[PDB]
Scaffold this active site. Structure first.
Site, PDB file in Angstrom:
ATOM      1  N   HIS A  41      73.135  50.376  42.056  1.00  0.00           N
ATOM      2  CA  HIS A  41      71.784  49.824  42.349  1.00  0.00           C
ATOM      3  C   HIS A  41      71.309  50.171  43.764  1.00  0.00           C
ATOM      4  O   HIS A  41      70.149  49.867  44.069  1.00  0.00           O
ATOM      5  CB  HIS A  41      71.671  48.343  42.047  1.00  0.00           C
ATOM      6  CG  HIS A  41      72.379  47.440  42.988  1.00  0.00           C
ATOM      7  ND1 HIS A  41      72.121  47.430  44.338  1.00  0.00           N
ATOM      8  CD2 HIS A  41      73.256  46.444  42.749  1.00  0.00           C
ATOM      9  CE1 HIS A  41      72.851  46.489  44.909  1.00  0.00           C
ATOM     10  NE2 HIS A  41      73.564  45.875  43.952  1.00  0.00           N
ATOM     11  N   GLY A 143      72.861  42.161  51.980  1.00  0.00           N
ATOM     12  CA  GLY A 143      73.570  43.287  52.633  1.00  0.00           C
ATOM     13  C   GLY A 143      75.082  43.292  52.385  1.00  0.00           C
ATOM     14  O   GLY A 143      75.763  44.199  52.838  1.00  0.00           O
ATOM     15  N   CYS A 145      76.527  43.434  49.410  1.00  0.00           N
ATOM     16  CA  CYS A 145      76.795  44.297  48.229  1.00  0.00           C
ATOM     17  C   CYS A 145      77.684  45.465  48.663  1.00  0.00           C
ATOM     18  O   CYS A 145      77.450  46.022  49.759  1.00  0.00           O
ATOM     19  CB  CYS A 145      75.504  44.803  47.594  1.00  0.00           C
ATOM     20  SG  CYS A 145      74.576  43.504  46.738  1.00  0.00           S
TER      21      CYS A 145
HETATM   22  C1  LIG Z   1      67.555  33.806  49.772  1.00  0.00           C
HETATM   23  C2  LIG Z   1      68.052  35.185  50.158  1.00  0.00           C
HETATM   24  O1  LIG Z   1      69.027  35.607  49.214  1.00  0.00           O
HETATM   25  C3  LIG Z   1      69.155  36.976  49.019  1.00  0.00           C
HETATM   26  O2  LIG Z   1      68.172  37.673  49.111  1.00  0.00           O
HETATM   27  N1  LIG Z   1      70.400  37.485  48.730  1.00  0.00           N
HETATM   28  C4  LIG Z   1      70.640  38.904  48.538  1.00  0.00           C
HETATM   29  C5  LIG Z   1      72.000  38.976  48.007  1.00  0.00           C
HETATM   30  C6  LIG Z   1      72.718  39.955  47.367  1.00  0.00           C
HETATM   31  C7  LIG Z   1      74.028  39.654  46.994  1.00  0.00           C
HETATM   32  N2  LIG Z   1      74.633  38.482  47.225  1.00  0.00           N
HETATM   33  C8  LIG Z   1      73.916  37.535  47.855  1.00  0.00           C
HETATM   34  C9  LIG Z   1      72.608  37.754  48.257  1.00  0.00           C
HETATM   35  C10 LIG Z   1      71.693  36.849  48.951  1.00  0.00           C
END
Ligand SMILES: CCOC(=O)N1Cc2ccncc2C1
Ligand SMILES: CCOC(=O)N1Cc2ccncc2C1
Lengths: 301, 300
Positions: A41, A143, A145
């Site tokens: 992705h 970030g 990932c």
């Molecule tokens: C309220 C903000 O949350 C996000 O945008 N993410 C991206 C994301 C991607 C992967 N694991 C956790 C998260 C947290």
């Protein structure tokens, strides 16, 4: 003595973490021999994530579309392919810090260490169980990932997890390092929820053994039981069934303490019905299920 | 999202861990530049356990009495001295894996990562806090002596703890890397016991601020408290006094969540009175005191 949730030392893995940028997306890659592994992705715009055709988005891309940075050093990408939900970026240089490693797929109930990373920079390490519902209760921000999970066996790193996404309930979902998801999840911006989780029965019993070994003994009792009898209590409390294979794996701990599994199942039966009568066990007011038998034996012997 | 006891990546510390042997005694040392730091009690025998005279036992040692070993390589000791309760073995090689480092003495309530090591080999990594009674609640088996505690803020490794001993209650005591013990403890096997421990009030409030940041609000209330009324209640549950300093340190978490520090103090006063009534906060059925205000911001 003492008992703590303990990760594997992360240094063998810290040396494999890089930054992978494709358009406006930066996330984490794993650099082993001459290949960088990351979630497919990374090639997706926000628009693409809604209904992505990865086949077609990727034939549209070329080597030079992928910026790979090991600390302060650009790697040259010389090949790209996709395996399931993982992107493989072949690079011009083999990682001189490549450890002895295998790719392994873990089973529900099994634990592993997570190295949380941001811009290819290792930031924290913590221990997770693969839940029966194929999620993990991680700590991940935007970030993260491409952050990976692993075990160590002597000098061999067994990589078992790559982080892809957060579900709406706050829990985390990802793939093995061959890009196969754990659990019924897809790498698209769609509506996805974790199944109702269940409690890992064999790990709770392992934790009660660790509690006894550390002189927490109050919850014990004169009684025993059978699989059949206990399992009807287990099913009622959203506990995984206890199999004969689990009882054998607890063998060592049953010996090392004088409490037999169905003897300990008698204690656990009582805690499920009656509660902890206002006590703790190893500084917890919950029945902890993210320590395996091996974790207890490792840490206690 | 999510909230976990999260240790620092241990790689920078792994590259410094060695095995030190003296007599029949083997433990862990810390190899930085041309020096290996280890507990001075490595030079004790069975009859030296109660009232060792370390200055007497050390003057009788030569460099060749100390067997230092980094993986396979034997390192040659060329010098030895004592600083407080820490032994310093000068060696003929500087450690090529020496990170940027510093030594810091921490205060009660502060957290760090522990790299538990046996025979100079790292075994696992976990987070601890310096308890208000100057102990840590660790996981340590025989041979773990010389394992260290550290922070890694901005690629510099700050060493704050070296493990010396386990006290009768199963809690752990050690020194900073200048060899001065945390707390009133000494490196003798004469009867010692930790002071009654207390809960780290400033860290519990930080963890409630973390729960609100992660979308939990069920434990807030419409009340406030004076700082003095908070302290008179909290000390009845064996909580540490909250000082104006602690109030200042929570200002950022206050500002981010829009809950005033003394409003959050009223929530905690209520949680102590009520318990959690079958609920949990960030996965816990107890109030957690091993996350600092800084740890909450770093992780959230
Ligand atoms: C309220 C903000 O949350 C996000 O945008 N993410 C991206 C994301 C991607 C992967 N694991 C956790 C998260 C947290
Ligand atoms: C055989 C000694 O008895 C123990 O079980 N210890 C030793 C020891 C020494 C230092 N830290 C922790 C421990 C745990």
């Amino acid at each position: 003595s003492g008992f703590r949730k303990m990760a594997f030392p992360s240094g063998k893995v810290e040396g494999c973490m890089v930054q992978v940028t494709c358009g406006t997306t930066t996330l984490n890659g794993l650099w082993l021999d001459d290949v960088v592994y990351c979630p497919r992705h990374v090639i997706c715009t926000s628009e693409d994530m809604l209904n992505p055709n990865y086949e077609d988005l990727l034939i549209r891309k070329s080597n030079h579309n992928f910026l790979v940075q090991a600390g302060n050093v650009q790697l040259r990408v010389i090949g790209h392919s996709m395996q399931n939900c993982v992107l493989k970026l072949k690079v011009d240089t083999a990682n001189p810090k490549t450890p002895k490693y295998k790719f392994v797929r873990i089973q529900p109930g099994q634990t592993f260490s997570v190295l949380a990373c941001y811009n290819g920079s290792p930031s924290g390490v913590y221990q997770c169980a693969m839940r029966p519902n194929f999620t993990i209760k991680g700590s991940f921000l935007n970030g993260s990932c491409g952050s990976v999970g692993f075990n160590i066996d002597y000098d061999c790193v067994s990589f078992c997890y790559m982080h892809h996404m957060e579900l709406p309930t706050g829990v985390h979902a990802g793939t093995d390092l061959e890009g196969n998801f754990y659990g019924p999840f897809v790498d698209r911006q769609t509506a996805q929820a974790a199944g109702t989780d269940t409690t890992i029965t064999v790990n709770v019993l392992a934790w009660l053994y660790a509690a006894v070994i550390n002189g927490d003994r109050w919850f014990l009792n004169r009684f025993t039981t059978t699989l059949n009898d206990f399992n009807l209590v287990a099913m009622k409390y959203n506990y995984e069934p206890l199999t004969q294979d689990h009882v054998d794996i607890l063998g060592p701990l049953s010996a090392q303490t004088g409490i037999a599994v169905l003897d300990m199942c008698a204690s656990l039966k009582e805690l499920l019905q009656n509660g902890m009568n206002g006590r703790t066990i190893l500084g917890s007011a919950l029945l902890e299920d993210e320590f395996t038998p091996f974790d207890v034996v490792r840490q206690c012997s």
